[PDB]
Every structure is written in C-alpha cells, then in structure tokens.
Short mmCIF file of C-alpha atoms and ligand atoms in Angstrom, two decimals:
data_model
loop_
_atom_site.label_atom_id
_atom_site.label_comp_id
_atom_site.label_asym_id
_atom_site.label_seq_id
_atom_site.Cartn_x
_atom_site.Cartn_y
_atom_site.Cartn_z
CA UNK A 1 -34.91 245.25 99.60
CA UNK A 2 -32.76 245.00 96.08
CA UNK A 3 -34.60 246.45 93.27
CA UNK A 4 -33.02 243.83 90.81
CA UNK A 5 -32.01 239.97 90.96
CA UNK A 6 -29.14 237.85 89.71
CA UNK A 7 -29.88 237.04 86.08
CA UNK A 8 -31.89 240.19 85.53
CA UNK A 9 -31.39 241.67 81.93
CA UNK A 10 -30.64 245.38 82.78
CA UNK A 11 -28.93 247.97 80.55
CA UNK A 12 -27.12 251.34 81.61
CA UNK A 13 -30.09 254.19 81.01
CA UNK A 14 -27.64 256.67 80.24
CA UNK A 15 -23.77 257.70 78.73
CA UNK A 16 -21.57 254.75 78.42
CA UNK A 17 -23.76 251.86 77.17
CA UNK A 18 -23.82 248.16 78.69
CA UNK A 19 -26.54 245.45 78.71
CA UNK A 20 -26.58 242.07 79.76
CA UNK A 21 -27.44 239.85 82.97
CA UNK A 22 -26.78 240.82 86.75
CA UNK A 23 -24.55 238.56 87.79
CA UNK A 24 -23.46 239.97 91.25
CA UNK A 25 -23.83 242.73 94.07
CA UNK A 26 -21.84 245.51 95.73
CA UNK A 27 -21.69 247.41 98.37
CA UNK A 28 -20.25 251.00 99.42
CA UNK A 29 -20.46 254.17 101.07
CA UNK A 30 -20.21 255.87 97.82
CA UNK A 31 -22.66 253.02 96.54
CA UNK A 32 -24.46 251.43 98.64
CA UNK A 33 -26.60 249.30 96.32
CA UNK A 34 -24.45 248.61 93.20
CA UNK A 35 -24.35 245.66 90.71
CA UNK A 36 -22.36 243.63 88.63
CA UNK A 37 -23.39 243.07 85.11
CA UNK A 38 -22.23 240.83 82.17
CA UNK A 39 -21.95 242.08 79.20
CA UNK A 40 -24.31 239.99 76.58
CA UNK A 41 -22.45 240.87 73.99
CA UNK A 42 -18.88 240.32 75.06
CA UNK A 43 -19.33 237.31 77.04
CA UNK A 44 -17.14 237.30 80.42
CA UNK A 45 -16.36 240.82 80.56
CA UNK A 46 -18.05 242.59 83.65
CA UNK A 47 -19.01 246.19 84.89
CA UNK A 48 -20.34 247.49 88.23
CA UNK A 49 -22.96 250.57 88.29
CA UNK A 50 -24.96 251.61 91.06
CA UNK A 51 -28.37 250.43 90.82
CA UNK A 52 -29.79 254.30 89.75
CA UNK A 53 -27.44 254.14 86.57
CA UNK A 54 -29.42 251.12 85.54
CA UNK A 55 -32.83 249.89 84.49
CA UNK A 56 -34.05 246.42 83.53
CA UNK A 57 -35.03 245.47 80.60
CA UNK A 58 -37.18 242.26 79.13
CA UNK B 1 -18.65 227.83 100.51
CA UNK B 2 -17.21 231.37 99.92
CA UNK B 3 -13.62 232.57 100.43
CA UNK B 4 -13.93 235.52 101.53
CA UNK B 5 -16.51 237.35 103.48
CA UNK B 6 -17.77 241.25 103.73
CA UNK B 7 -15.29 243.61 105.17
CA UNK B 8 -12.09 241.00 104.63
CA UNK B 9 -8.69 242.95 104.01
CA UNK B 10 -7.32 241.76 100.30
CA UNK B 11 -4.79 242.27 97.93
CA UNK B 12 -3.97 241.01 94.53
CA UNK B 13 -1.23 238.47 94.88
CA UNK B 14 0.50 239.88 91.64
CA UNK B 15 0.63 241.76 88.35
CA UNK B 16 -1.52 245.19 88.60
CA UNK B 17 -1.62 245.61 92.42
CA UNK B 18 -4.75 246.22 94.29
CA UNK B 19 -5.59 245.91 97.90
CA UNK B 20 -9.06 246.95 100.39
CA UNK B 21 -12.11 245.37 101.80
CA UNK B 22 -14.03 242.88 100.37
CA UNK B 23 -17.77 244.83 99.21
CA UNK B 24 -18.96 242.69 96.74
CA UNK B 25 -19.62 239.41 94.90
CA UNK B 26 -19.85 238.01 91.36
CA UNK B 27 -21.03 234.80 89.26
CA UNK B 28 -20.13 234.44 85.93
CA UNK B 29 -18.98 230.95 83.81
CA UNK B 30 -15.66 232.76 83.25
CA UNK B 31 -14.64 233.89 87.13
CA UNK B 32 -17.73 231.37 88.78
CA UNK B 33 -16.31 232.77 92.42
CA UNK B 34 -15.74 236.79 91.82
CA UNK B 35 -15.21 239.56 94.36
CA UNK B 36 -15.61 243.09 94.46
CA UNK B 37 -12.86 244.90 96.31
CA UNK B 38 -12.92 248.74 97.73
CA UNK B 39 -9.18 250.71 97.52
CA UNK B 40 -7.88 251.34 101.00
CA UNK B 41 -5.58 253.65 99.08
CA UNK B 42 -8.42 255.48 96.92
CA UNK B 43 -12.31 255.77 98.54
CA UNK B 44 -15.21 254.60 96.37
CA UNK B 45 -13.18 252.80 93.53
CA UNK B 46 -14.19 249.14 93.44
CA UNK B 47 -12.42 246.73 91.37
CA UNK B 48 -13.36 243.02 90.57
CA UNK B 49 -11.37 239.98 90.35
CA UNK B 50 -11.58 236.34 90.79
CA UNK B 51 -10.87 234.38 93.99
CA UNK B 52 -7.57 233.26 92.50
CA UNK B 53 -6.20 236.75 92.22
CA UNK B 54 -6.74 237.39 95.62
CA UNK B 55 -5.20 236.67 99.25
CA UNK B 56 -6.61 237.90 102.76
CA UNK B 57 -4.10 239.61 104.95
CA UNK B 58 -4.53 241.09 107.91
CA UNK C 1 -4.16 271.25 72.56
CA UNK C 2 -3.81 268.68 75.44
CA UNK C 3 -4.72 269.57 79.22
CA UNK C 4 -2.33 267.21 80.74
CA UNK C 5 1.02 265.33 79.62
CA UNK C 6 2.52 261.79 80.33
CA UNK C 7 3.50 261.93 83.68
CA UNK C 8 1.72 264.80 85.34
CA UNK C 9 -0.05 263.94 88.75
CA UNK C 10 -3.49 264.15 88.89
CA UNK C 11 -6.34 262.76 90.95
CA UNK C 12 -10.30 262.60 90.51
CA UNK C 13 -12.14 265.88 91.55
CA UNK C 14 -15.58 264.20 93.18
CA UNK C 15 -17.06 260.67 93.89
CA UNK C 16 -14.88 257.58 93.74
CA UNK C 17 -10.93 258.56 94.26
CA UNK C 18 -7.84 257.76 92.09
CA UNK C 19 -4.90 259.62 92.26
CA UNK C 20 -1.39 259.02 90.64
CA UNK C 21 0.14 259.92 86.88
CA UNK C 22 -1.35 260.36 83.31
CA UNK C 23 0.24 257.04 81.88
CA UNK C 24 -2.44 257.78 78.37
CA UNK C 25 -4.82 258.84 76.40
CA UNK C 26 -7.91 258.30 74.46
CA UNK C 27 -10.82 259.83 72.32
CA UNK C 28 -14.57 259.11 72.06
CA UNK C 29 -17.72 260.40 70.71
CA UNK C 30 -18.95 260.96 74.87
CA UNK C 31 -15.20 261.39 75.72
CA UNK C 32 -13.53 263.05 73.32
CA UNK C 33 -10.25 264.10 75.80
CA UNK C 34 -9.74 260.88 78.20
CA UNK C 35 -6.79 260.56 79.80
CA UNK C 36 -5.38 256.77 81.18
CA UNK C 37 -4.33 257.38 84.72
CA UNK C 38 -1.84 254.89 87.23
CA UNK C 39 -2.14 254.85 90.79
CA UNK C 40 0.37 256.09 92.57
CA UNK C 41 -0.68 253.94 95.99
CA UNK C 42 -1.56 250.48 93.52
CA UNK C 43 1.29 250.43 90.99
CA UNK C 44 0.35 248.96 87.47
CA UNK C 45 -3.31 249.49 87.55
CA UNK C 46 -4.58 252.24 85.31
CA UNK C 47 -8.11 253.51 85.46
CA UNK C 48 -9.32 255.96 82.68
CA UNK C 49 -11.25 259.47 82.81
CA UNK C 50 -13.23 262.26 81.11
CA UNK C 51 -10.45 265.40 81.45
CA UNK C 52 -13.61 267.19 83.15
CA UNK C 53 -13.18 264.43 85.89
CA UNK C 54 -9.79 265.20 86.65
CA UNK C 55 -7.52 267.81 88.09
CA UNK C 56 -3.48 268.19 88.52
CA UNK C 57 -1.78 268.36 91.86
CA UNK C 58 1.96 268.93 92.60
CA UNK D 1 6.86 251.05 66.74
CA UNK D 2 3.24 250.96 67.76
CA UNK D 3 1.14 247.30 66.68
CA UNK D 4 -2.18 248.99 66.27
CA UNK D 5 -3.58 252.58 65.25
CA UNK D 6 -6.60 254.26 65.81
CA UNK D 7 -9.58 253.21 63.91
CA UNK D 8 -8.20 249.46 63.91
CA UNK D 9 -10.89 246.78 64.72
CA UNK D 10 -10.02 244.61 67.55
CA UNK D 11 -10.96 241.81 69.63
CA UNK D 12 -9.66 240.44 72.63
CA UNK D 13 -7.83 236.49 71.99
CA UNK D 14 -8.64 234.69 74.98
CA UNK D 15 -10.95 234.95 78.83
CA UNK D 16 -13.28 237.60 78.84
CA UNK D 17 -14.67 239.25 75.11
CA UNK D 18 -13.99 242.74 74.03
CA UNK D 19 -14.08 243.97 70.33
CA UNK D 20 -14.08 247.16 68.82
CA UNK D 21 -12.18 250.01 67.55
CA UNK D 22 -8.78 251.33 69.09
CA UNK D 23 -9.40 254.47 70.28
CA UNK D 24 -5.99 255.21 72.80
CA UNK D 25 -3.24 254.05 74.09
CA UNK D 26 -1.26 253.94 78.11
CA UNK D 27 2.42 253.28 79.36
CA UNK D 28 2.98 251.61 82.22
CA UNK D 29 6.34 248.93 83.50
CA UNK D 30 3.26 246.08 83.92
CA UNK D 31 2.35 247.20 80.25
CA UNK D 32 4.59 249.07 78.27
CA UNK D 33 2.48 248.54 75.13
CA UNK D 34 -1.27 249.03 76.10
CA UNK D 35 -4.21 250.20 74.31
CA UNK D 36 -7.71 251.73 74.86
CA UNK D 37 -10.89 249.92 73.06
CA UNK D 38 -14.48 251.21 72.74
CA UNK D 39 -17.00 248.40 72.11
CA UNK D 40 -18.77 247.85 69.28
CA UNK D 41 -21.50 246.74 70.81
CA UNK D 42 -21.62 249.12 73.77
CA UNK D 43 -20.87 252.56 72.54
CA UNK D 44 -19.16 255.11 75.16
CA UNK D 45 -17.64 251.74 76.61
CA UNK D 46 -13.78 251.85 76.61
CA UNK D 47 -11.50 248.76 78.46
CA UNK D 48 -7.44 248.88 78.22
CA UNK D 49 -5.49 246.05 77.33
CA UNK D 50 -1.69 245.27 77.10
CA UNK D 51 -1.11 244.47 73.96
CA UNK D 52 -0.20 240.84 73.49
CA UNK D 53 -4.20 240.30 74.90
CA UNK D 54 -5.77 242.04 71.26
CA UNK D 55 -5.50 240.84 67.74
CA UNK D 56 -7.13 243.06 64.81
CA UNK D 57 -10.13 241.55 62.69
CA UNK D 58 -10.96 243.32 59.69
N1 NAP E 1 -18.26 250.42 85.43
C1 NAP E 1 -17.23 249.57 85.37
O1 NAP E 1 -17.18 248.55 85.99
C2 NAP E 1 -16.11 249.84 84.40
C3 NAP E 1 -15.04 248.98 84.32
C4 NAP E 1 -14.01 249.24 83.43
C5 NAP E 1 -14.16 250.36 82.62
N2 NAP E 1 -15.21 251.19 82.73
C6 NAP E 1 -15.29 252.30 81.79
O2 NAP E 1 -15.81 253.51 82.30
C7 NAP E 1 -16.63 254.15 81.32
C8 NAP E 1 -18.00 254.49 81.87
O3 NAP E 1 -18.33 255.70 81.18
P1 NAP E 1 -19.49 256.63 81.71
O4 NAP E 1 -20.12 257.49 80.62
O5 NAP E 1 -20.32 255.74 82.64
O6 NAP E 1 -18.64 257.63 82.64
P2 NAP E 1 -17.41 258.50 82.07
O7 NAP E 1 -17.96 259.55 81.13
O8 NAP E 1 -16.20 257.63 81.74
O9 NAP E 1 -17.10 259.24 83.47
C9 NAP E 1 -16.26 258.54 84.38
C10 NAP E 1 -16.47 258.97 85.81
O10 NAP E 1 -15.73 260.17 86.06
C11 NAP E 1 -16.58 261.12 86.70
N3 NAP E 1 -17.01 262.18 85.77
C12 NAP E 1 -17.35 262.09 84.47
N4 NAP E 1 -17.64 263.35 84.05
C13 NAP E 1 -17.48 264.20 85.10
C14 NAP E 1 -17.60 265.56 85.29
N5 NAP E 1 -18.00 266.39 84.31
N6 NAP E 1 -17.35 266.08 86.51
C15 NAP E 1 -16.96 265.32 87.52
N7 NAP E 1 -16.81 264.01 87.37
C16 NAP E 1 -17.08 263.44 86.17
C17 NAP E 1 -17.71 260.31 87.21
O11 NAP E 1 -16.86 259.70 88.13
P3 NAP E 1 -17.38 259.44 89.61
O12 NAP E 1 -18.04 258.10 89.40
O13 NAP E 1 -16.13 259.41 90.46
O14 NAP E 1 -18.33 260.60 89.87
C18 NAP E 1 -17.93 259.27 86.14
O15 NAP E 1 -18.62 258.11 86.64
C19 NAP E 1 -16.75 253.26 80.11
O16 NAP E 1 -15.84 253.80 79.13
C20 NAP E 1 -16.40 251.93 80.78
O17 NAP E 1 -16.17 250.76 79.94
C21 NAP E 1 -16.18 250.96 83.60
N1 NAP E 2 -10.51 244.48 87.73
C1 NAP E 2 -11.31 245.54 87.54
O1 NAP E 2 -12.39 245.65 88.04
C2 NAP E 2 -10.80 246.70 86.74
C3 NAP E 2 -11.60 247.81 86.53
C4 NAP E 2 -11.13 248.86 85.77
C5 NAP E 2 -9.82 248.77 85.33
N2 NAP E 2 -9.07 247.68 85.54
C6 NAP E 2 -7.68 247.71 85.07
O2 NAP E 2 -7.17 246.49 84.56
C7 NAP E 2 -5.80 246.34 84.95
C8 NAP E 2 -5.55 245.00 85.62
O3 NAP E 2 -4.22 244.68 85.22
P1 NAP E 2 -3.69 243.21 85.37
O4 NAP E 2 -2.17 243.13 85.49
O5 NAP E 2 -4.63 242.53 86.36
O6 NAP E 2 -4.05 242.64 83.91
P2 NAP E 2 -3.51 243.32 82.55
O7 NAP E 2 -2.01 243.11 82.47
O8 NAP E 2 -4.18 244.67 82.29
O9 NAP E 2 -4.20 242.24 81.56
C9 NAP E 2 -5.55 242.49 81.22
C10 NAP E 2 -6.29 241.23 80.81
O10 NAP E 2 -5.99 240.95 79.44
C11 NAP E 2 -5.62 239.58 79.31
N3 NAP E 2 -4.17 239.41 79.14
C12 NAP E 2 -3.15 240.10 79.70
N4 NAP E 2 -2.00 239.60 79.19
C13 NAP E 2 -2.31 238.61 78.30
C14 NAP E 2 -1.61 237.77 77.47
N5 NAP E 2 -0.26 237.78 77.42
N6 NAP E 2 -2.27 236.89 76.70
C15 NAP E 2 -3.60 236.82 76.71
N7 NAP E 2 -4.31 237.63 77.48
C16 NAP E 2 -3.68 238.52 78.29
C17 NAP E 2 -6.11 238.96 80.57
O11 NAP E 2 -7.43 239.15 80.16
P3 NAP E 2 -8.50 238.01 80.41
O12 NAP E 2 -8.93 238.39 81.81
O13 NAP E 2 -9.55 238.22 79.34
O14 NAP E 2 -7.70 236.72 80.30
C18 NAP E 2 -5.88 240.01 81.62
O15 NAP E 2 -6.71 239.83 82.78
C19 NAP E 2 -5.40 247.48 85.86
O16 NAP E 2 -4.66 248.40 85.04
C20 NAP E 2 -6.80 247.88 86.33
O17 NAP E 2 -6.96 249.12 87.08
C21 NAP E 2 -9.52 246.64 86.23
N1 NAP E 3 -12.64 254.55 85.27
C1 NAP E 3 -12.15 253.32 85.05
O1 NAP E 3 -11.28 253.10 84.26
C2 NAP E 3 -12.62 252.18 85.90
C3 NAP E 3 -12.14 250.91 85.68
C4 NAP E 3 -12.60 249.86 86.46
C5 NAP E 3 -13.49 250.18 87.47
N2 NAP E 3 -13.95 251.42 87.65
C6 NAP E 3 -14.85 251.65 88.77
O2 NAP E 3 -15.90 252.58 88.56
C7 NAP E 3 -16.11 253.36 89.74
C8 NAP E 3 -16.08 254.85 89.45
O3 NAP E 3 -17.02 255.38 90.38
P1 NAP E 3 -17.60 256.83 90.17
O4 NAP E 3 -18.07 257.47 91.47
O5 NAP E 3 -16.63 257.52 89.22
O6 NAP E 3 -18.93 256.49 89.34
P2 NAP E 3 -20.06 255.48 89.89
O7 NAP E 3 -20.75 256.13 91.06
O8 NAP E 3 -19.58 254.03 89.89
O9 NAP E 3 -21.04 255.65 88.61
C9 NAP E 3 -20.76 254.82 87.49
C10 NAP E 3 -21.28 255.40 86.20
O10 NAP E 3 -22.68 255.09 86.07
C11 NAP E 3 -23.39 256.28 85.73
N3 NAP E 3 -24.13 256.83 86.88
C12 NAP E 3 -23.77 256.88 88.18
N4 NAP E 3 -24.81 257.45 88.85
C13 NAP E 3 -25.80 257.73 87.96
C14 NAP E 3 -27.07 258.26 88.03
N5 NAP E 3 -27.59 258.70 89.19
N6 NAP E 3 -27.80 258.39 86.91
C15 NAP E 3 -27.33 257.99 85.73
N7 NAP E 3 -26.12 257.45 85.63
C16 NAP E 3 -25.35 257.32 86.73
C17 NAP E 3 -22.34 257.20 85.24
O11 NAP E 3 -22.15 256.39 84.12
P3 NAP E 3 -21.94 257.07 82.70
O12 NAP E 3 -20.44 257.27 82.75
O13 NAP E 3 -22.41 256.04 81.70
O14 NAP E 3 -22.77 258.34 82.77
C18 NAP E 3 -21.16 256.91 86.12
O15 NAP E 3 -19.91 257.33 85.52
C19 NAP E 3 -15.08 253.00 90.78
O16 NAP E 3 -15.74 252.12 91.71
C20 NAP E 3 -14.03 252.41 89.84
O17 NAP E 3 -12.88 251.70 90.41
C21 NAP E 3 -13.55 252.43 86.89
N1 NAP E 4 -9.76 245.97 80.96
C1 NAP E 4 -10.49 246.99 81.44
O1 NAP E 4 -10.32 248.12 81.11
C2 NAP E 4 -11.63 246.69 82.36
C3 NAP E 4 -12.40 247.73 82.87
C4 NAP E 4 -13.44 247.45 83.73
C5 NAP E 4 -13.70 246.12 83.98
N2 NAP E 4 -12.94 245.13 83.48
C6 NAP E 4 -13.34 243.76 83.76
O2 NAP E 4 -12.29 242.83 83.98
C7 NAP E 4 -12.62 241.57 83.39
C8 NAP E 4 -11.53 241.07 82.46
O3 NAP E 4 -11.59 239.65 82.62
P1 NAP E 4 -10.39 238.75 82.15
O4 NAP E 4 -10.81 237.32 81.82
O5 NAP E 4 -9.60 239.62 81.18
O6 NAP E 4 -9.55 238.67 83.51
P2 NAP E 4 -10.19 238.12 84.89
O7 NAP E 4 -10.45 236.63 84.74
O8 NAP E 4 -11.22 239.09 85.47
O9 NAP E 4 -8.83 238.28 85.75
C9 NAP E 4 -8.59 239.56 86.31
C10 NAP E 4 -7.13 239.82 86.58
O10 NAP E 4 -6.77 239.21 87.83
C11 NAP E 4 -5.58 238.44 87.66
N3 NAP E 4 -5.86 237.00 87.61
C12 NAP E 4 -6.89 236.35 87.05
N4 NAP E 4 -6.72 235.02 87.31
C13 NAP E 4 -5.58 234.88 88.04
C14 NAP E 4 -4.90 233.82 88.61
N5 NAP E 4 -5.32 232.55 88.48
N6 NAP E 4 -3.76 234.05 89.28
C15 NAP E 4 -3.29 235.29 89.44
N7 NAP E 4 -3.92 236.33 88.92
C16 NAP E 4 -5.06 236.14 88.21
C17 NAP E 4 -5.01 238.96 86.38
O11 NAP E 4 -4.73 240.18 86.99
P3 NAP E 4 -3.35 240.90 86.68
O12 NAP E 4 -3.76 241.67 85.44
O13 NAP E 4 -3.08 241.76 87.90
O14 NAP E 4 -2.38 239.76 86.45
C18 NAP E 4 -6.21 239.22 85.52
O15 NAP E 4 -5.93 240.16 84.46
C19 NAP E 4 -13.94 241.68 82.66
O16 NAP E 4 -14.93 241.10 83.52
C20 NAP E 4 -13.94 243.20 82.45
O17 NAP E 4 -15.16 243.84 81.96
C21 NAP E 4 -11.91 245.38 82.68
#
C-alpha cells in the first residue's frame, strides 16, 4: 500500500527543500504514512515528512 | 534481527533526553539500525536516533 | 521588534506538539522570525519554529 | 564571546554532513554555545548544532 520504496529519490514539493533517497518509514496518528529521507547532498543527515509533503523524482 | 519493535516504550540513554513509542525505522551507512520515536510528553513529534542511543523500558 | 524573549514558555498552536522555553533564535528567507524552543518534559532537546507556529502560555 | 556570526559558512566536522550559512543561535545547559544552519544545498533547511560539532570554510 506505500506509495514510495526504500532507495526512492524523492524531494520535498514544497517550503523547506530536501532531496535524496528514502531510507526508512514512519508511522503516526498525526502521520500515518511518513518517511525518512537522506539527504544526497549532506550525506548521513536525515529528515522525516509525511508522504503528501513529498514527490519522487528520477 | 531488529531491536526494537512497533509500539516499544524508549528513551535516550543520555545527552538531549527523549522518550515514547517506537513508530518508525531507518537505514542509512551512518546509523545502519535507526528508529523513529513518538514523544509521550509531546503528540505527533517524532525524533530519530540510532539503536545505540536508545534503551526499552517499561 | 521580537514576539518572544529567552525564556518565555511557549508551545506549538496545531499538529505535532512541543511545549517548553524559547532557548533561540534564527532568520531565513521562508522563516524570517524562528524561534529555537526546549522542552520542558525532554530537557536538552530543542526543536525550532516559524513565530506563526507558536504561541506563549503562563 | 560568540565563535561564529551570521553569514559565516559552515560545515559540520564529523558523522552526519551539514554545510551552510549561520543563520541563529540557542542556549541550553546540554549546549550552552549552539547555533542554527540553513543548507546550502537545501534552502529553507535549518539543523542546530553545539558548537564544538561546526568549523567555518570560507
Ligand atoms: N523534517 C525533519 O525531520 C526535520 C528535522 C530537523 C529539522 N527540521 C527542520 O524543519 C524545517 C522544515 O521547514 P518547513 O518549511 O517544512 O516547515 P517550517 O516553515 O519550519 O514550519 C514548521 C512546522 O511548524 C508548523 N507551522 C509552520 N507555519 C505555520 C503556521 N503558519 N501556522 C501553524 N503552524 C505552522 C507546521 O508544524 P506542524 O507540522 O506541527 O503543523 C510546520 O510543519 C527545516 O528548517 C528543517 O531542516 C526538520
Ligand atoms: N534526532 C532527531 O530526530 C532530531 C530532530 C530535530 C531536532 N533534533 C535536536 O537535536 C538535539 C539532539 O541533541 P543531542 O544531545 O542528541 O546531540 P547534540 O548535543 O545536539 O549534538 C548534535 C550532533 O552534533 C555532533 N556533535 C555534538 N557534539 C560534538 C562534538 N563535541 N564533536 C563532534 N560532533 C559533535 C553529533 O553529530 P553527529 O551525529 O553528526 O556526530 C551530535 O549527534 C536535540 O536538541 C533535538 O531535539 C533532533
Ligand atoms: N521543528 C524541528 O526543529 C524538528 C526537529 C526534528 C524533528 N522534527 C519533527 O518534525 C515534525 C513536525 O511535525 P508537524 O506536524 O509540525 O509537521 P509534519 O506533519 O511533520 O509536516 C512536515 C513538513 O512537511 C511539509 N508538509 C506537511 N504536510 C504537507 C502537505 N500536505 N503538503 C505540503 N507540505 C506538507 C511542511 O513542510 P514545509 O515546512 O517544507 O512546508 C511541514 O512543515 C515532528 O514529528 C518533529 O519532532 C522537527
Ligand atoms: N541537528 C538538527 O537540527 C537535526 C534536525 C532534524 C534531524 N536531524 C538529524 O539527526 C541526524 C544527525 O546525525 P549525527 O551523526 O549528528 O548523530 P546520530 O548518529 O543521528 O546520533 C544522534 C544522537 O543520538 C546520540 N547518540 C548517537 N550515537 C550514540 C551512542 N553510541 N551512544 C549514546 N548516544 C548516541 C547522540 O545524541 P545526544 O545528542 O543526545 O548525545 C547523537 O547526537 C541527521 O540524520 C539529521 O538530519 C538533526
């Protein structure tokens, strides 16, 4: 049912800008279908967005 | 092979303190076992951190 | 000019919660009054917000 | 008394990557001497960082 994968390029569509790979998955009332996504530029460093803040990317 | 499950109390053993349910997973080279964590304290907010920071209590 | 000082107690208005004292500051382009805020229920971990995301409590 | 100012272009030394300008600054006990960093690469992105984690580049 998750509309992306791990390693999925994906950027934030709007605001605040990130882009890099999925690399993980979350789950909350608040968001209940969220990922985790490294950065491509700044290797190691991580953010978590639900999935309708992001959109992938080839 | 995982830690921790879904829904398993936490809390950061030390430095900034966090502590709530396990709702989330990560994979990176950096933190290769990640979680995401839920406040107890504050609804919603989800931080990350590597199995090392963290210890189940009950 | 400032909405809030060091120290005053504030917590998120909507979505994800966080509630303790302004601890900081900072200034983007998208954010151009952010404020650095430290839970007051996970001592020594600071989130930081848009002033239109916050309000003050007693 | 303050090791950076705004404007200054920063990285992070060591674990996960960060670099970009300076853009605040926070208080806390943990870290009495922290900063607030947009990315470079991902504008509208801000981290915080105590400051023995950051060194400037030019
Ligand atoms: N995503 C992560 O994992 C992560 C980790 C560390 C740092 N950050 C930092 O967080 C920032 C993300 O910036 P952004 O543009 O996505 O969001 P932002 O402008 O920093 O807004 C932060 C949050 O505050 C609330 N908010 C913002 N404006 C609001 C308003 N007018 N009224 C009510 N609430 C408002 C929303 O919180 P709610 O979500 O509670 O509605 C929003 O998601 C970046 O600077 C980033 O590096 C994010
Ligand atoms: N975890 C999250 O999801 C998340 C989200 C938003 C905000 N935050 C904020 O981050 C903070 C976590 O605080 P903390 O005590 O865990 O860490 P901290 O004291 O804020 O240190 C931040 C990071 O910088 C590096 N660092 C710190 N001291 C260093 C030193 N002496 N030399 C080299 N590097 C150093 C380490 O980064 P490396 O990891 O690169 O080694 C450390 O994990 C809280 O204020 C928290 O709310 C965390
Ligand atoms: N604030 C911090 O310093 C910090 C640090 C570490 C972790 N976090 C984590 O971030 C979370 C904050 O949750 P929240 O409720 O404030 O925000 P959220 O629901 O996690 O949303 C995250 C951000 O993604 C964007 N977004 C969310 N829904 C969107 C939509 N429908 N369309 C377009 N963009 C959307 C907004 O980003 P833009 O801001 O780019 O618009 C929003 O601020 C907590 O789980 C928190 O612990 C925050
Ligand atoms: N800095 C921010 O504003 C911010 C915002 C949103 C997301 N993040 C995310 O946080 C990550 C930063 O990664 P990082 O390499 O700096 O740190 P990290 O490897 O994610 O470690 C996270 C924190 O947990 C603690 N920790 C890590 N390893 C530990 C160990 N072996 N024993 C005890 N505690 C340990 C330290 O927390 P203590 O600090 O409590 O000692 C460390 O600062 C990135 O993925 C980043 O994007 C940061």
């Amino acid at each position: 049912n998750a509309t992306f994968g791990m390693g999925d390029r994906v950027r934030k569509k709007s605001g605040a800008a990130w882009q890099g790979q999925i690399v993980g998955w979350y789950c909350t009332n608040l968001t209940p279908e969220g990922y985790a996504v490294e950065s491509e530029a700044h290797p190691g460093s991580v953010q978590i967005y639900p999935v309708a803040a992001l959109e992938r990317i080839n």
